[PDB]
């Protein structure tokens, strides 16, 4: 049912993806490509796939293990009984970098037009997997939220943006609005107010 | 398992997907979701004759535009395939940011179809490329696209010029918005 959004490691190290709340199959899926069974029935692996891939189960959670990591393994990994969330595996080729989070309020022009949009610019982060959560007066918000998918920049780090669309009164009613971004277990929150 | 790489249709009609020798729907950036299970099982048909299995989309909506796979091992995949102008929104540097002696402008491009755009910045009609990054489009919830561009400046490099502007091109049309230090 639930897996980390991202797992990363240097081009030789071990990656361990964890599927939680559970026979478990693991499917590897490259962009455009169909998902393919990397491991079936907890630990049994198909032929043609390398020895590097191994499946395990501890308690309520089952794990996928990738040893001798290589750029070829850079993919989205899903667990299945239904499917889990998905884990993006990254083969680290540069120092990890925490995103810089810049939260912008609606301009005087946008409000003058009876529109309101908050923009949370997330930039300079590697690996390219981030989680974004909005909060209106310390209370979560998922309605109105729209997030860009990470994109490799000029410096090889990634950049994305999340925006919240609101009514000018919604903006003025709450004393605050926050943008929480999560990158490799490191969370950074920024707030903006009228 | 074999499948037609792509199947085209018109909104309000029907579309067919064949699988040779369970059906799953996959939108970008998400896991697949079991639509029909064991030729029977959110209302579409998944009936089959001979060595092949077909999946039919009853009401051809826009929220059904996804990759469809079949299983027993997954089929190769089949991608099931009205113009909207981009909404360009320009933001000045945050009052918070200028107190940290940094400054960034964000050009937010949204609610557009098809998902392909171009960007160009200006600092009083003089085009600038210095510290400009543009993100790649992504299909938002309303089926139309979103992408953003940003310009990194110094608090003085922003307050020196009278105005700043991004210029967004999309299907031969061009949108330009302007911001000036307050």
Author numbering:
A (entry chain A): 4 to 25, 29 to 87, 96 to 208
B (entry chain B): 4 to 24, 31 to 50, 57 to 87, 96 to 104, 109 to 209
Paper text:
The crystal structures were all refined to satisfactory refinement parameters; in all cases the LCs were dimeric, with an overall quaternary arrangement closely matching that of the previously reported LC dimers. VL and CL domains display very different structural properties in the seven crystal structures. CL domains (res 115–214) are typically characterized by high quality electron density, are all very well superposable, and the dimeric CL–CL arrangement is clearly conserved in all the analysed structures (root mean square deviations -r.m.s.d.- generally fall below 1.0 Å over the entire CL–CL dimer - Table S3A and Fig. 4B-bottom).
Each of the seven LCs crystallized in a different space group, with distinct crystal packing; the crystallographic resolutions achieved ranged from 2.70 Å (H7) to 1.65 Å (H9). Such results indicate that, although characterized by low stability and high dynamics within the group tested, these LCs display a properly folded native structure devoid of large disordered regions that would hamper crystal growth.
